[PDB]
Design an enzyme around this catalytic site. Structure first.
Site, mmCIF file in Angstrom:
data_model
loop_
_atom_site.group_PDB
_atom_site.id
_atom_site.type_symbol
_atom_site.label_atom_id
_atom_site.label_comp_id
_atom_site.label_asym_id
_atom_site.label_seq_id
_atom_site.Cartn_x
_atom_site.Cartn_y
_atom_site.Cartn_z
ATOM 1 N N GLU C 204 44.780 45.195 45.012
ATOM 2 C CA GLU C 204 45.820 44.243 44.606
ATOM 3 C C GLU C 204 45.639 44.043 43.103
ATOM 4 O OE1 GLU C 204 48.439 43.256 46.259
ATOM 5 O OE2 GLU C 204 47.848 44.400 48.036
ATOM 6 N N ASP C 205 45.522 42.819 42.618
ATOM 7 C CA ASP C 205 45.353 42.547 41.199
ATOM 8 C C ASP C 205 43.928 42.144 40.837
ATOM 9 O OD1 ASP C 205 48.227 42.915 40.029
ATOM 10 O OD2 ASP C 205 48.480 41.878 41.928
ATOM 11 N N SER C 206 42.952 42.314 41.721
ATOM 12 C CA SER C 206 41.603 41.840 41.456
ATOM 13 C C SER C 206 40.888 42.729 40.442
ATOM 14 C CB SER C 206 40.795 41.773 42.749
ATOM 15 O OG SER C 206 41.236 40.693 43.543
ATOM 16 N N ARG C 375 54.158 48.395 37.762
ATOM 17 C CA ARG C 375 54.322 47.451 36.651
ATOM 18 C C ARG C 375 54.658 48.160 35.358
ATOM 19 N NH1 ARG C 375 50.667 42.342 38.320
ATOM 20 N NH2 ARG C 375 51.081 42.591 40.523
#
Ligand code: MG
Ligand code: ZN
Ligand code: ZN
Ligand code: ZN
Lengths: 115, 67, 477, 528, 98, 34, 44, 98, 257
Positions: C204-206, C375
């Site tokens: 994820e974004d970790s 992104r």
RNA sequence: AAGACCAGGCU
């Protein structure tokens, strides 16, 4: 505020046994070794030494959780040989190799220093 | 504030090289030559002296709030 | 226009507009009109010449400045609705020179196209290589990046002040950061970032962080809390007094320790203060006594940094106390690059467990590759390559937005001269087993920011606590 | 007034009867933990120390409850309160009170939340009933909630400063209800669209594809490690696909041990062409691109989002329908653990070389863009000399815009197709798009080839100035450059005007995201 | 007290007529970072109500080129209504047309 | 006379002169002074 | 109580109910010397 | 004496005006601090620029439902002296009247 | 069925650096050795700090953090010292700690640099390594810094201040013959300093029968321990860890038997 | 106490 102290990586407290031995009921002649307060440094060494034994059928290790400091080693051997004997023999072989490596490293240092 | 003692990545001591780096840069070495002269080979130690900002000089301008 | 350019009787702030089709001529001297400077173009040539640039380069000890440049008729201020009658050239060397012509009536030229960005958007390296929502996200997150906000912070008595131990100026910089004074007060650290899927804790974004680097002062900071307290006289005989209460003399009494207070009821600086500790012992004589003493915010676990005693507007005794605590980055804390790539810390591995190059370099931060494809923050990759080039070259890279003199092929060619793979990839070894990783991982230094949001300030739990007075329901907050 | 007290939101009825603040609730930041089960949640000790569960003293548990009472509130596991049969509440947190620590059947001991407790776990926008599922508590250090990553898509959560709520049921009956109704494995398949809700996401899906390709051959020690990370493994090492030169196992051969029971499924990979089904090689697919699972064993095929994802007839859906919720849980957990631990060997990354294309491909893209711009110039010249005929039902402006949009869309599509064809088999952008983990073919096209046309309110960029878009352009300029067509790619970088037009394009998306939410929520509330 | 109150509370007008008075002006200066302080000192506010679902006044207009930063706005109900100043933008102070 | 593709130095020199004279908050200070 | 002055750094001897003005210079800001009691830090 | 007016920091009437680095450091003031804010009751307050429609200029718009097809208006002010914010409208009634 | 017979060559040996090659041993052996180089080698570092007066511009735990990162000459007495948790006394003594004292005041106008040279120890064997000097803090006129510090014994698992090493280079199979890494384009990759192939060819031919066999090392010391003795201490510590498992595992077998 | 305004965060 929930940070564990720096020493759970390396230190036992009251009641913790360094090693715990449990037999595996799924497969005959299989055992499960639980090493407390150790990490990959020792598990990889022991697994690699155990895989050289021709009488060992299975050898693997894992860390169940990185935030916990615990090693589980599974050893399955052929019928006329105990995985406990396989583990002891692997440890002895590793110690014997390390002692020889230390002696040869010291000899190399002395040969390098006095030309 | 002030130069860190250790490089964060590898752990080499860069705390004793800030003054020498400043001296070389004042003595007309470029930054690349000065870092090589100081003995900082890999990019992790080089970035320490290259990107450091010395605010402790600015902080020393203010008078101490006690004797 | 001649009189405005000669500053004779028309101030340069006055805008003049001729609408030819409607036959109107409008002149505004009104306040509140927004305008920007532009270079005047006469025929196909700028009025800015080499003598002006020589004098401006010798600006020191010559008393020749931007006002003298304006007075020479070289630059002009133009507001919004005068731009409607203006033919602008993006750059002189490109649009003024003869080609198969688009236009020949150019009347003005921009100073530099990067001047269209604001203060917070001017710190982004390569902003034209990113998606606009990500640029907006970075513009919003840059206001929350921690650093040294003002140099005299040790004098200021402010609530909620955050200061970083070792700020660093970016290795990849924009030409406009010099005018934003970002060198003097940086808000982040250059860190070796490897974009790889290592153990699944960065999904994820970790982010995975290096614990050995954190132990060396990486992204360590200090949090200052200030407390105001006021002596006052409100009733005829009812007054407030700073004093150390005795154990059962006052009416209000909590099991908290009052032993840390001094004679005047104020903790001296340098005293460790934890939850429920009374920083200021203030008693209100009950017309025996009522305890209005102030306590610390729960679990703040800080140390009294400074104690100040003054007199306010009215003239009563007034006291300020500043408490500090150090906070070492943990799993829940929020970290972000200059490209909109924000993330918490999934886990921290020591130096032994981190992947390493042939030279023993281990990444400080590991980020998931899955954050990139959707992104579309290519400026992140270009920054990572440029910083790797700069750390070896000894220079600081230039990432100003619209400069054609920097491209990815040139950066790769420069990097290839230092013994590295020209696209930034590098062979990594597994930290746990020592085996090589089959894929080659993209690594390099990238500028990272620590954000104000920390898990210690957000964690909360409740079981039969305070009850609201009117609804008899649990409290809010 | 009283009307104002009762009327609006935060008024009495809606703000204190339909919804209200509750006790025994916790909130903190969520972080991933791939080592947890899909029904487990990591809970910090401080929250578990604060939160309590009342438990009734019985002859079975009286010794354990007495040990908890002796530990008290100081040491982590003990009791906070003791409640007598008369309802009097005894507090253990201030004083030892050794005469009051006696226990008998009928008392209630409020112990600290321990491993195995059942908790409801929630994320706030709360759109469907999978936004609140019951979890099983595991206690971990530090201060963040930890959950498995397949559970993220039900909650719509990502690990970027996100906080989630924790509700702890306080009675045995309500604990039984949550266990029997709202547990995570019981909520795999939604009644909304009869599809699985949880799937394989992120690193694990890309690693699934790369692991399940034909070229994956696994050595003995690697096989033993991967089997060490299997929880449902029977303990028998399968015979390797290759024997004599060296013993070599295959990724499909180990994936077949992950697959539970005897499951029969047939899917197709994303890169499957339609030519293979027509001619020969129907059942011996040359690209490895059809999926056949027989008798709980993967015979051929490359797995992807179409096989392990959240779709009708997926492998996970069939596993649930055949085996039930308990076995599907172990299926998710085993896939996660073993394939993350294999990905530790191969690794995955993204970089600049993944976004740089060939020099011939760049020339082809530039030629296509120049041809498209010349065609738009020709169309403009046709309209300028009044030779353009208006399409039925359409204005001259409408047909002119339609033709230009057609030309530009064809150009952008052709350039994207060329860029996708130029990709190598080692490209990490392709490896991520093909497996369906994240990204898409339009993202690859915009990164490598051409960002494309920018639109505001579904139209081409308008004339904010009198008869032009910016003061850099001439009045009455309908060419692609003046009206917001971005010729460059993200790798090449945008010119100043294209950058401003792209900012205008993204502002519309941000505004729509900020605006639509109120109307959607108001519709949802009225429907409910 | 009129200047002090209107600068302290932020309500812009008579304190007795605070209902008709415009609010939101004169916020507490942001000291989290130097960039935050600069951005707060260079900021513009649209008086259009935040509740309005009409998208038009929020969109990035062409005429903002070089005057207002295209990238920098808050996220939420105030998208496009709070705008920051460009680096070289200058606001006229006014003069008499004598 | 003309700047012959020394332009990158020239435009940043004039920008430096502008920001050396004015700064970033002139709209605040000028408005209050007036 | 011993109070350091805020402009001139002279310490003042002072007591409760004394209004704060520094004896040397008339300034109204005072600081309390760090206490004498010791606090132990770890160098981690 | 009729009152006290708060002073914007580092303006022409502030005590920090024209001081050098040494003077600012002696005064415990950061030279990098830009000023442009007020100090009210110890807190730092920053006035936010308020956008508004221009005055004294004729504008023409078109409302949807209004009785008028076109509405011209002129928000007028007397040089920002004695300001009433008087608005005239001059509207064209819609031809669609039945 | 048995242990390796490894051999050591040493190519470069200086006061900073040790380049050596270990042949004929397992990859896990080599990885655990390089891992013990970082995390299991004991050294002396400052752990307890008490500050009496600190009027500098850096705060107390800032200064304490810098003090812990200053390397101390650990060459001799780290074998003699006990761990504090194993020491028999209740409070700090010479068998389990070393005392350091700092007392600096800036009376002169020009700025004084407080360096590691100003740290004074109770015993002569354990000076800070730099005796240019590691800068602790700068003092303006009138500023003062007095403190006491005790140094203890620990290793890299506890804290990175107990890391004796300044990065370990580790490498095997410089020419990619085992294909443990797969180059999409082999011609774009620079050759290792240990490469044994011509300028014209990119990779060695694939070896299906090979296993990883030479490990190239480069241990760079931070100054506390000599790089020659770092390796010896690491080997001894790993052997001791294995012997402690053999011992406690023999007891657990006897408990089952 | 309570009320008000403002700013920010996650969708
Ligand atoms: Mg999120
Ligand atoms: Zn380094
Ligand atoms: Zn004084
Ligand atoms: Zn002792």
């Amino acid at each position: 505020m929930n940070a564990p102290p720096a020493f759970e990586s390396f230190l036992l407290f009251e009641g913790e046994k360094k090693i715990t031995i449990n037999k595996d009921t799924k497969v005959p002649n299989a055992c499960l070794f639980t090493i407390n307060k150790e990490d990959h440094t020792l598990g990889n060494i022991i697994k690699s030494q155990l895989l050289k034994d021709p009488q060992v059928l299975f050898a693997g290790y894992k860390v169940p959780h990185p935030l916990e400091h615990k090693i589980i080693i599974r050893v399955q051997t052929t019928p006329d040989y105990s995985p406990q004997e396989a583990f002891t023999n692997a440890i002895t072989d590793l110690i014997s190799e390390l002692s020889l490596l230390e002696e040869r490293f010291r000899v190399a240092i002395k040969d390098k220093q006095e030309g | 504030m002030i130069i860190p003692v250790r490089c964060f990545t590898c752990g080499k001591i860069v705390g004793n090289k800030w003054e020498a780096y400043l001296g070389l840069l004042q003595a007309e070495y470029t930054e690349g030559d000065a870092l090589d002269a100081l003995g900082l080979k890999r990019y992790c130690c080089r970035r320490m002296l290259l990107a450091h900002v010395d605010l402790i000089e600015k902080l020393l301008n203010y008078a101490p709030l006690e004797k | 226009r001649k009189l405005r350019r000669q500053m004779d009787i028309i101030v340069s702030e006055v805008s003049m507009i001729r609408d030819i089709r409607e036959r109107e001529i409008r002149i505004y001297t009104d306040a509140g009109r927004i305008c920007r400077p532009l270079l005047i173009v006469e025929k196909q040539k700028l009025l800015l010449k080499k003598r002006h640039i020589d004098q401006l380069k010798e600006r020191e000890y010559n008393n020749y400045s931007w006002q003298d440049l304006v007075a020479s008729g070289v630059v002009e201020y133009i507001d919004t609705l005068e731009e409607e009658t203006v033919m602008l050239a993006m750059t002189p060397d490109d649009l003024q020179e003869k080609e198969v012509a688009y236009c020949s009536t150019y009347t003005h030229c921009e100073i530099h196209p990067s001047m269209i960005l604001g203060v917070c958007a001017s710190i982004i390296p390569f902003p034209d290589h990113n998606q606009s929502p990500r640029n907006t996200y970075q513009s919003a997150m840059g206001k929350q990046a921690m650093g040294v906000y003002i140099t005299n912070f040790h004098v200021r008595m402010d609530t909620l002040a955050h200061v970083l131990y070792y700020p660093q100026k970016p290795l990849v910089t924009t030409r406009s950061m010099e005018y934003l004074r970002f060198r003097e007060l940086p808000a982040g650290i250059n860190s070796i970032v490897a974009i790889a899927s290592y153990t699944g804790y960065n999904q994820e974004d970790s982010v995975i962080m290096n614990r050995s680097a954190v132990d060396r002062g990486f992204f360590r900071s200090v949090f200052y809390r200030s407390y105001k307290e006021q002596e006052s006289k409100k009733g005829f005989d009812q007054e407030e007094v700073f004093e150390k209460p005795t154990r059962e003399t006052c009416q209000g009494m909590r099991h908290a320790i009052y032993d840390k207070l001094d004679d005047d009821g104020l903790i001296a600086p340098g005293v460790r203060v934890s939850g429920d500790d009374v920083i200021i012992g203030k008693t209100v004589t009950l017309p025996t006594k009522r305890d209005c003493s102030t306590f610390l915010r729960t679990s703040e676990t800080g140390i009294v940094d400074q104690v100040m005693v003054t007199l306010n507007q009215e003239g009563y005794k007034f006291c300020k106390i500043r408490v500090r605590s150090v906070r070492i980055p943990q799993i829940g804390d929020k970290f972000a690059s200059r490209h909109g790539q924000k993330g918490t810390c999934g886990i921290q591995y020591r130096q032994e467990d981190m992947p390493f190059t042939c030279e023993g370099i281990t990444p400080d931060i590991i980020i998931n590759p899955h954050a990139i494809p959707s992104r579309m923050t290519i400026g992140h990759l270009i920054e990572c390559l440029q910083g790797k080039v700069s750390a070896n070259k000894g220079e600081i890279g230039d990432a100003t937005p619209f400069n054609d003199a920097v491209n990815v092929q040139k950066i790769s060619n420069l990097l290839s001269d230092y013994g590295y793979h020209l696209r930034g990839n590098e062979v990594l070894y597994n930290g746990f087993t020592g085996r090589k990783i089959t894929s080659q991982i993209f690594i390099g230094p990238t500028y990272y920011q620590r954000l104000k949001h920390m898990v210690d300030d957000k964690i909360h739990s409740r079981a039969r606590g305070p009850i609201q007075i009117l609804n008899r329901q649990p409290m809010e907050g | 007034s009283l009307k104002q007290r009762l009327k609006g939101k935060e008024g009495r009825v809606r703000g204190n009867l339909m919804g209200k603040r509750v006790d025994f609730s916790a909130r903190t930041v969520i972080t991933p933990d791939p080592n947890l089960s899909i029904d487990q949640v990591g809970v910090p000790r401080s929250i578990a120390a604060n939160m309590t569960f009342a438990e009734i003293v019985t002859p079975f548990n009286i010794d354990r409850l007495q040990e908890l009472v002796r530990r008290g509130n100081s040491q982590y596991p003990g009791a906070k309160y003791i409640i007598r049969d008369n309802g009097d509440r005894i507090d253990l947190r201030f004083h030892p009170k050794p005469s009051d620590l006696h226990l008998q059947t009928g008392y209630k001991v409020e112990r600290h939340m321990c491993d195995g407790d059942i908790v409801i776990f929630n994320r706030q926008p709360t759109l469907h009933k999978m936004s609140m599922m019951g979890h099983r508590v595991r206690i971990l250090p530090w201060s963040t909630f930890r959950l498995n990553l397949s559970v993220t898509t039900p909650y719509n959560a990502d690990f970027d400063g996100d906080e989630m709520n924790l509700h702890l049921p306080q009675s045995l009956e309500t604990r039984a209800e949550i266990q029997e109704l709202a547990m995570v494995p019981r909520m795999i398949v939604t009644p909304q669209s009869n599809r699985p809700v949880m799937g394989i996401v992120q690193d694990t899906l890309t690693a699934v594809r790369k692991f399940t390709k034909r070229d994956v051959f696994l050595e003995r020690g690697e096989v033993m490690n991967l089997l060490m990370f299997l929880s449902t493994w029977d303990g028998k090492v399968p015979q390797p696909a290759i024997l004599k030169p060296r013993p070599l196992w295959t990724g499909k051969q180990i994936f077949s041990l992950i697959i539970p029971g005897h499951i029969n499924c047939i899917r197709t990979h994303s890169t499957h062409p339609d030519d293979e089904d027509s001619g020969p090689y129907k059942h011996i697919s040359p690209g490895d691109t059809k999926v056949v699972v027989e008798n709980g064993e993967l015979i051929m095929g490359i797995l992807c989002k179409k096989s392990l994802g959240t779709s009708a007839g997926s492998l996970v859906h069939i596993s649930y329908l055949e085996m039930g919720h308990d076995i599907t849980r172990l299926f998710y957990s085993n896939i996660q653990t073993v394939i993350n631990n294999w990905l530790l060997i191969e690794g995955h990354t993204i970089g600049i070389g993944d976004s740089i294309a060939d020099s011939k491909t760049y020339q082809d893209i530039q030629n296509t863009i120049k041809k498209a711009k010349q065609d738009v110039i020709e169309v403009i010249e046709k309209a300028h000399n009044n030779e353009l005929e208006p399409t039925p039902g359409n204005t001259l402006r409408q047909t002119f815009e339609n033709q230009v949009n057609r030309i530009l869309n064809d150009a952008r599509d052709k350039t994207g197709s060329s860029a996708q064809k130029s990709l190598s088999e080692y490209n990490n952008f392709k490896s991520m798009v093909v497996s369906g983990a994240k990204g898409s073919k339009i993202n690859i096209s915009q990164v490598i080839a051409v960002v494309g046309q920018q639109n505001v309110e579904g139209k081409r960029i308008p004339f904010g100035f009198k008869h032009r878009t910016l003061p850099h352009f001439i009045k009455d300029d309908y060419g692609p450059e003046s009206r917001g067509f971005v010729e460059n790619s993200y790798l090449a970088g945008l010119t100043p005007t294209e950058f401003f037009f792209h900012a205008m394009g993204g502002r519309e998306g941000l505004i729509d995201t900020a605006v639509k939410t109120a109307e959607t929520g108001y519709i949802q509330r009225r429907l409910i | 007290d009129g200047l002090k109150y209107s600068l302290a509370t932020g309500n812009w007008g008579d304190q007795k007529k605070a209902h008709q008075a415009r609010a939101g002006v004169s916020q507490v200066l942001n000291r989290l970072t130097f960039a935050s302080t600069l951005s707060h000192l260079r900021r513009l506010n649209s008086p259009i109500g935040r509740d309005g679902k009409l998208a038009k006044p929020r969109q990035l207009h062409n005429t903002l080129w070089g005057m207002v930063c295209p990238a920098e706005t808050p996220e939420g109900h105030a998208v496009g209504l709070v705008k920051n100043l460009a680096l070289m933008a200058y606001i006229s102070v006014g003069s008499q047309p004598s | 006379e003309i700047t012959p593709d020394l332009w990158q130095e020239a435009c940043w020199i004039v920008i430096s002169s502008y920001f050396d004279e004015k700064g970033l908050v002139r709209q605040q200070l000028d408005s209050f002074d007036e | 109580m011993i109070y350091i002055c805020g402009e001139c750094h002279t310490e003042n001897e002072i007591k409760s109910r004394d209004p704060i003005r520094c004896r040397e210079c008339g300034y109204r800001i005072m600081y309390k010397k760090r206490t004498k009691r010791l606090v132990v830090f770890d160098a981690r | 004496f009729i009152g006290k007016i708060p002073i914007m920091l580092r303006s022409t009437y502030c005590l920090l005006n024209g001081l050098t680095d040494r003077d600012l450091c002696e005064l415990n003031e950061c030279p990098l601090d830009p000023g442009g804010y007020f100090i009210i009751n110890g807190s730092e307050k920053v006035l936010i620029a308020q956008e508004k429609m221009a005055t004294n200029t004729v504008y023409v718009f078109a409302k949807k439902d209004s009785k008028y097809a076109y509405t011209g208006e002129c928000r007028s002010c007397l040089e920002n002296s004695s300001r009433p914010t008087s608005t005239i409208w001059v509207s064209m009634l819609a031809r669609g009247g039945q | 069925p048995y242990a390796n017979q490894p051999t050591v060559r040493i190519t470069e040996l200086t006061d900073e650096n040790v380049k050596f090659i270990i042949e004929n041993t397992d990859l896990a052996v080599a990885n655990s050795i390089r891992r013990v180089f970082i995390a299991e080698v004991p050294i002396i570092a400052i752990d307890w700090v008490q500050i009496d007066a600190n009027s500098s511009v850096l705060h107390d735990e800032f200064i304490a953090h810098r003090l812990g990162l200053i390397p101390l000459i650990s060459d001799d007495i780290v074998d003699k010292l006990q761990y504090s948790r194993d020491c028999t006394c209740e409070e700090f003594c010479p068998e389990c700690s070393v005392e350091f004292t700092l007392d600096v005041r800036c009376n002169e106008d020009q700025t004084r640099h407080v360096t590691s040279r100003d740290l004074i120890s109770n015993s002569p064997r354990v000076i800070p390594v730099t005796s240019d000097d590691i800068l602790i803090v700068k003092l303006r006129k009138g500023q003062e810094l007095r403190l006491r510090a005790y140094a203890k014994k620990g290793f890299g698992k506890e804290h990175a201040k107990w890391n004796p090493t300044a990065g370990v280079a580790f490498e095997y199979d410089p020419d990619n013959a085992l294909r443990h890494t797969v180059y999409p384009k082999p011609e774009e990759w620079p050759k290792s300093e240990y490469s044994e192939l011509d300028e014209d060819e990119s990779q060695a031919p694939y070896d299906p029968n090979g296993k990883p066999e030479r490990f190239y090392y480069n241990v760079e010391s931070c100054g506390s321990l000599r790089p020659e003795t770092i390796v010896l201490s690491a080997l001894s510590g790993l052997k001791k860890k294995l012997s402690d498992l053999q011992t406690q595992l023999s007891h657990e077998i006897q408990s089952d038997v």
